[PDB]
Amino acid sequence: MHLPNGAQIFVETSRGEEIEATAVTNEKNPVATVASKGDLAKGDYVIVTQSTWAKMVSRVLIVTDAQETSITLAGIDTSDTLVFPAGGTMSFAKITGWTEIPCVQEIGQDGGEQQYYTYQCLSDDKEQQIPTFKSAISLTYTFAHEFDNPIYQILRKLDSSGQVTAVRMYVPKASEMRMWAGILSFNDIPSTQVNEMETVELAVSLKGDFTFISSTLAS
Amino acid sequence: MHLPNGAQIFVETSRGEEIEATAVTNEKNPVATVASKGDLAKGDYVIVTQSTWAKMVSRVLIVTDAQETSITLAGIDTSDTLVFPAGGTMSFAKITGWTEIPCVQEIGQDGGEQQYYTYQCLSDDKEQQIPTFKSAISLTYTFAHEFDNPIYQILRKLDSSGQVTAVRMYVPKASEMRMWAGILSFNDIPSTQVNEMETVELAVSLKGDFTFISSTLAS
Amino acid sequence: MHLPNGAQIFVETSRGEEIEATAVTNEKNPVATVASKGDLAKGDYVIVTQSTWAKMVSRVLIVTDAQETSITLAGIDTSDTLVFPAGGTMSFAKITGWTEIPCVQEIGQDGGEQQYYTYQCLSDDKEQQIPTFKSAISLTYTFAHEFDNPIYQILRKLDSSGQVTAVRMYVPKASEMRMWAGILSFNDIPSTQVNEMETVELAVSLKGDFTFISSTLAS
Amino acid sequence: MHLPNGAQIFVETSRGEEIEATAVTNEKNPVATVASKGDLAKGDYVIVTQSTWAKMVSRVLIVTDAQETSITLAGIDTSDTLVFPAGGTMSFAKITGWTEIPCVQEIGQDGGEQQYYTYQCLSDDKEQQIPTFKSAISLTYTFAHEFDNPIYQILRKLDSSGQVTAVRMYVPKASEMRMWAGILSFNDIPSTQVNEMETVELAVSLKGDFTFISSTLAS
Amino acid sequence: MHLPNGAQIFVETSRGEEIEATAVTNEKNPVATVASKGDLAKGDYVIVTQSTWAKMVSRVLIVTDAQETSITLAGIDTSDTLVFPAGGTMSFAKITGWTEIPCVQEIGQDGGEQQYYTYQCLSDDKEQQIPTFKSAISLTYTFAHEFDNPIYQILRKLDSSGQVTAVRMYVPKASEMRMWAGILSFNDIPSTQVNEMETVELAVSLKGDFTFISSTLAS
Amino acid sequence: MHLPNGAQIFVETSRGEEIEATAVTNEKNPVATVASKGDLAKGDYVIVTQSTWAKMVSRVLIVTDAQETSITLAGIDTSDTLVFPAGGTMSFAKITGWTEIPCVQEIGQDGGEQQYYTYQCLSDDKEQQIPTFKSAISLTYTFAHEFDNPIYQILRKLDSSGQVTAVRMYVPKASEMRMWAGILSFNDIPSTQVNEMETVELAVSLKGDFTFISSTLAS
Amino acid sequence: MHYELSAAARAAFLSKYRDFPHYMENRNFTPPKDGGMWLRFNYIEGDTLYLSIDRKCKSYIAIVQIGVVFPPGSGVDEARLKAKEIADFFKDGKMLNVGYIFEGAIVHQIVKHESGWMIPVRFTVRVDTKET
Amino acid sequence: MHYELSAAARAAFLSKYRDFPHYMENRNFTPPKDGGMWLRFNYIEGDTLYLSIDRKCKSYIAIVQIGVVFPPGSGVDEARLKAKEIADFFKDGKMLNVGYIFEGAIVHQIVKHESGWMIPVRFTVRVDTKET
Lengths: 219, 219, 219, 219, 219, 219, 132, 132
Known about the structure:
part of a larger assembly; 8 chains; A: mainly beta; six-stranded antiparallel beta barrel; 2 helices; 7% helix; globular; G: alpha+beta; five-stranded mixed β-sheet; 5 strands; 21% helix; Terminator protein (chains G, H); Tail tube protein (chains A, B, C, D, E, F)
């Protein structure tokens, strides 16, 4: 029942040192037996780079409790056991800082319509179908064009490298915080027209799934 | 001549123990010789999981009369004999509780247009066709997005499992109650726009046929 | 946040003598050890015709500092080393003069939408894609038709020759100067209608990339 | 910056005797060493029927200076030497009279959009294209329908013969005179509607290129 | 009625010591007499190498019960006695390791087309044929190409050795478990094309017949 | 998981003097004893011409360590000893030059289909086959046509001589490095068609097997 | 939930401008004797939207207008400064204690009269209610 | 940023026409006794547009109208010449010290009266502000 006015978009600029976790148990809020806390603290975002658990790969999570050998993460449910076998290793890095895109004109997306497989049997007359995979998700952002804005070089480097980068979104009315990671694509050709400001296009795909957490949990 | 304003949508959350019926006779209101009444009562919804009668499979029915060894169901006609041969076994389960979707913005559906086969004969000149099978039915629901609403985990579990779940609809003006079962599909990507509330999409296919009963018969 | 009103378009009319550079170092503002300064001066536009560095080919650059043996260019970043190996030779020519198109009605472009490759794996269920190449860029200009305007013969010669020509654009509000080079295409069939002026169509493709510099840097 | 209101369209009705030219020199205004002046005069339109110069074929030209053995034509540039090798022969005829189409409702054309060839190389990532041939040009005229207008038989004969005929257009505001030749096509099926005049359709293709001359040069 | 999406393919990398069984009886669930219990445990896959019975040579088995001198296996029915003479001895190996094939694009199979022997007799008019032996089974796998996986040396040594190797594959949807064995043939020539996923192909043979067990029984 | 876009193809033009190695041992990283250090340096490609060991004849190697009497090579595993008898001598050449193939449109390969030897026995009913030797490998290249490149005389002399030549190709995306050698067959008959890119085709053979090394190790 | 929305708007307005002379709906008020400027408060009802199909979750829209009146022949500088302060205080997205501002900080054209001018400042508020 | 826009427009207008008789908003002014022409200055508020989705970067539109009034029975030549000069001075794209001219040099039809005529010259100004 909320309204998406006032939303903000942030994009990661620099990650940190790789951290290895020996094992993690599966419950509502998983806890990982890390070798050393390192630079981790309260309310710092982390992203996993590789793990045995195929479902939980390249997912942006948020730390909840920090200890010398135990770390607590929130945003992913591991209540089930068959999909999350015990003993899976885990590795993640820490996002150092965030940079904010200037004021954004329009937000749009395409894909995600579920597909169906239709089969007709000779025994019966009515035709029925079953659900199948879903199409890919692509997010498109449009914002004002500025020639000397510092984020342009960062976006160019991210596009050239092809690495996976985390994106954050904040909705003040819903008091939420969306998190996802994907491959960035940058277009730097202004759309010149008459009596309206020219803009540039930024597109990011998806590698994992969306995670929704409460705003007050972050800080 | 009624109006569909004020409609409500309910979805099953948990079924009960399997119940086996030895045989059922075929009339206007079929009666089944159940081994034991069990937890059945007056006005409790049941769903069949498997039966010899191919037409009556995965159909949501409503109990009418409850006895120690005989149970009465309403909503399906078995007057015909050739399509419903005598001696067919029957098995069903009981729906324990229902959960209600929050206020729903739009309702839509696609498919169901009947197909035709067109044949041209050399003897005559005019071309004629005959009816054929019907296309699949898919129901689409759109409702407001809430991050912490308790039904989200239930919908995710139902989507992951892939099992068949019953759906109920109530129309106060027509004093009716529609019943059907299908495979649930859940989409959790909010559609962000400007100056309008963001929503999420829920889609359910069809495995059986619609059943229409009077509201006063339920209770 | 600027507005593209008041923009102007210039097209090259005649280049100069070829100049060879032995070697160039890679930094923020590259400097080239030219054999002789020649006719180079402060704030004169140059275009490269061939070089070992594949990325920096047919790119319009602007001179910054002029010396007897060293020349300084601005508009291209060479901070990276792997993409710009040391020791690459460089050759460029100097644009002598510019000519201005008469007042231009509409500006438009097509292409540039990024392509994706979609792959589905049997191990998982969700479908994901990766970025791929971008489509070609074509710029279209429309301006008033004049039979005896002197630039018509120049445009016809440029179309017939098929050579690469540099184009310049100036945006007073943003205080910028866009530069690119491409193959010119000229259409000289007026579009006769009623109660509106007839125009002609000019189209130019792209061979390199856009370069953005500050207006005050030019002069 | 002119306006095409008040335009007029003329079509050739009868040509004259064939005239042969031994040789023509190549400059801004070519001069041909004709064997005899014949019936040529000042400001008379001529059309070439065949020549060694492939580019200058079926082009409508206008005479400028008339002498006993030398004739001067304007409207085509022959400054280049490689495309117009010296020694090419030339032959042309003279248009005797012109006839004028009645008042014309609408003017339209289709085709002429330039084509491109897109090639993708494995060495690079960006995709680029090059210009290619242009599509054919077709001109469409629509004018009021009159059953006994004398030009109908002429148009029918021109359509049946299939020969090449010259067309002229005059724009008073621009003080210009367009010239071209093509194959005529005539449609004589009135478009009956309600409360609007019925018209007929005339279409002419193109065999050469447009020529633009000043109105004062003609007379 | 199950969709094959989500399945995984496994191949072993090492086998344990050979174990010899003194005798085994023939029934629905065969039980064999073994000299020593060995390292066998519950839910272990078993491959035989040679035995008196020709039908169950090179066959993959699952253990059902573990005992010092008696072992229980499931997957092959020995109810028939005319084709399974008594007094037979078993010699089976021990699977120790399991490895997973990487991201697989598509899978395919060849063979299985049973040819028929046709005979014509003068006594009768209608031509009649009889069934014969089936053709060989050829199976092909194509999976993602990435050298860094340490499985390729295993494939090289398996191909060079030519020893009999089994393939493990599991279907989450149907909760089945598919065993077979054959000779591996791995091809290390990548298929390279522009703007598409680079992959390699793998081919295997068959030593016996397809064996099918339930996933729940295995683990 | 790497896209083959951006790769480059290289071919050598000259080889250095022959170098003879007295002896070499077999291990993961073979080391050979050489009479003199020679002109060998770090990160140099090496091709052998003849040796006692048949498997590593006509094989491309990379040096790892440089010493006066000992050289270290990577790319071939010599852990096995039964197929690699000791007491072998090496004779390898020295690559001095590298040349780049021009703009390439598409690449392709042929062969690698392993046929199977089929045998039928009266003792058994099911027909069984065995693997056999693989087919030859045919590789085809088609690149841009432009005579001015001075590489065509190199291709002519390579084809006329028929001597063994290697091909170098590097993949930026996967950071791999692909070595192989064969006999070059260059065809100089351009494929000419209207409105399309004119190109020529090149074909090569294979002398040994594909050898794969890491790009970072090479340089 | 329409009475509480006006109550919240009034609460905010008095929280900011308790001491400044102001006029309130349907209350006897006399302009200052010194001829200085005074504030004007009005509440304009909007429309209620039925969003869902069960006619349960609703929405309420309202318009609040604040006008500044200043004597003739005294310039338009201080009036525009006061209007700027008014617009800055009622920032967009401000969360009231019953609802929130849907659209804020809008200044319209001046209306002229021979006794006193007026610069109207207008914004809107919204509230969402779920009926159970 | 709406007060500074009017301030900038006034600054430019007085920079060009300090000495010519003119009228300013809400100030007592009497027409010249000699019956000659005098200038008229008005400021018309436009609308403020919320451009982005975070409601941070905004825009302001305003309309400035300058009218020339001339006595009846004295022709329309010099009035049109003065209007032409007014239009030429306020060229399109002119950069003010707070904003810039979005649309300039527009002359509308004459309004007639039995005491004095008027030729209205109208243009627009725009400013862009980023809120942080």
